[PDB]
Design a protein around this ligand. Structure first.
Ligand SMILES: Nc1ncnc2c1ncn2[C@@H]1O[C@H](CSCC[C@H](N)C(=O)O)[C@@H](O)[C@H]1O
Lengths: 18, 484
């Protein structure tokens, strides 16, 4: 398969207080 | 109209958005109150600080030349404004599946490392939020280079969209459709975080001398920050660093122009050549749009983070919170059986639309949740106890016919109970989509709240078929399958 598959628009954490 | 008035309103918005959660029953009230302050500030500002005189298609040729000069593929595709998905890539030649048709070298990318070496560097080394939030650091990196006329990424920034369909751009009545759903809480958090982060960094830019050399000190409107974070959350990638130590977030030109379709992940990163690569997910004839597979995200994540609703999403899912109560008579044994199977005592599982509706982890939890005392002892004592735990997530080897009837009965009742928590039904949602003329953003919200109920309703029918099947095996006293 692929060595480093990347995700377009991967969900990240924007809660700066968490 | 006065800089002192903006400093007053941002400080008020900062205190309003820094307060703790007011409780689930008052989140809609706080959301409308935050919108009132944000819209008051936005109507007193001049929109985007940096605008371009030409249309969006006028800057794509400069994007192709700028990318070709750095070793990126610029042949075999063209930019076409599609109605369904927006601007995308269309094949100018036949492209067979598994063919490497797109490569973008590391130099063209906008990463967190390139943000540390830019003009944002001094402020990045002193601000704690930028150091811990790489996505926010990427957003201000995109804003600083946008305000830099001589920026290296100017050919890329001039081709980015000027507006997005994230919930940050929705109107109050469009978000109102999501009431009593699971997704509306994430819409509340997204709006509250964005409003707080803008007010915070607006005060820092105007006061902190480390931000005095930034171009954002001359103009930093809320529209700039809403555009920046929306550009990141809808287009960012997670790539490894140049050495492969840790991972990082990046904006990849050219590659982020392909729209989404169902399939497998074919976009990867080649570390030896230090470039992003994309192979054809399927056969693309000349004149067909070139699609990729973004990821196994749900429609709720596509709407909130990506800014669109994808029909026929094969990975769409809803959340369901289950746990063993301490008041249960068999809590001690059920907690130990789950601990030996690597499953928490209380967690948030998922219900999928495609078969199977429940995963192996949720099936193992529901089985232990309905075990009798004899069945719990067989999973804790004896030489065959480890073998029984090993097959808890397998649908071929149940604990007993009685255990299956009880777990599918509970799931049918729980999924039907969650359906009764929505303010509208499935038939009412389909009636609105047929007898009302709506905007794209309004259709996204209604189809999102409808998608949650259709996944719940299919779980009710799936549990009823399993309940009646294992009831026949229990009534006929069929032999239990043994894993050998
Ligand atoms: N299948 C799809 N249907 C609708 N919109 C899509 C889509 N796939 C991607 N998009 C849109 O494409 C954006 C991702 S970036 C991809 C390029 C974008 N179309 C552009 O004009 O620049 C998303 O935020 C979403 O708006």
């Amino acid at each position: 398969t692929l060595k480093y598959p990347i995700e377009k628009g991967i969900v990240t954490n924007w809660d700066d207080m968490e | 109209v006065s800089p002192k008035e903006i400093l007053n309103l941002t400080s008020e918005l900062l205190q309003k958005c820094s307060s703790p959660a007011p409780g689930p029953g008052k989140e809609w009230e706080e959301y409308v109150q935050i919108r009132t302050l944000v819209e008051k500030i936005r109507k007193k500002q001049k929109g985007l600080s940096v605008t371009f005189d030409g249309k969006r298609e006028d800057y794509f040729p400069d994007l192709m030349k700028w990318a070709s000069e750095n070793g990126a593929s610029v042949e075999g595709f063209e930019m076409v404004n599609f109605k369904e998905e927006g601007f995308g890539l269309r094949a100018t030649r036949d492209i067979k599946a598994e063919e490497l048709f797109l490569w973008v070298p590391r130099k063209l990318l906008m990463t967190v490392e390139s943000a540390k070496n830019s003009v944002l560097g001094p402020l990045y080394s002193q601000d704690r939020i930028l150091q811990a939030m790489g996505n926010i650091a990427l957003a201000f990196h995109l804003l600083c280079e946008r305000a830099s006329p001589n920026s290296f990424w100017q050919p890329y920034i001039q081709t980015l969209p000027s507006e997005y369909d994230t919930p940050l751009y929705f109107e109050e009545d469009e978000v109102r459709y999501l009431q009593s759903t699971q997704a509306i809480h994430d819409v509340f958090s997204q709006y509250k975080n964005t409003a707080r982060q803008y007010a915070y960094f607006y005060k820092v830019i105007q006061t902190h001398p480390h931000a005095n050399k930034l171009p954002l000190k001359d103009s930093f409107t809320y529209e700039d920050y809403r555009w920046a974070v929306s550009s990141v959350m809808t287009r960012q990638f997670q790539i490894p660093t140049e050495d492969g130590s840790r991972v990082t977030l990046a904006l990849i030109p050219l590659a982020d122009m392909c729209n989404h379709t169902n399939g497998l992940i074919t976009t990867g990163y080649n570390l030896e050549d230090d470039r992003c690569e994309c192979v054809a997910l399927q056969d693309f004839r000349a004149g067909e749009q070139i699609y990729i597979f973004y990821g196994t995200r749900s429609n709720a994540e596509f709407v909130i983070h990506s800014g669109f609703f994808f029909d026929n999403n094969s990975h769409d899912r809803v959340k369901i919170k289950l746990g063993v109560s301490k008041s249960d008579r068999l809590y001690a044994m059920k907690a130990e059986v789950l601990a030996r199977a690597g499953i928490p005592t209380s967690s948030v599982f998922a219900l999928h639309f495609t078969e199977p509706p429940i995963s192996a982890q949720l099936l193992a939890f529901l089985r232990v949740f309905c075990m009798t005392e004899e069945e719990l002892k067989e999973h804790l004592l004896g030489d065959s106890a480890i073998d029984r735990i090993f097959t808890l997530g397998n649908s071929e080897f149940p604990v007993s016919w009685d255990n299956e009837v009880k777990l599918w009965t509970f799931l049918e009742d729980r999924a039907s109970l969650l359906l009764k928590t929505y303010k509208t039904t499935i038939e009412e949602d389909k009636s609105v989509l047929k007898n009302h003329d709506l905007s794209v953003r309004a259709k996204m919200a209604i189809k999102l709240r409808l998608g949650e109920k259709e996944i719940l309703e299919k779980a009710v029918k799936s549990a009823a078929v399993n309940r009646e099947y294992y009831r026949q095996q229990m009534e006929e006293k069929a032999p239990l399958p043994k894993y050998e």
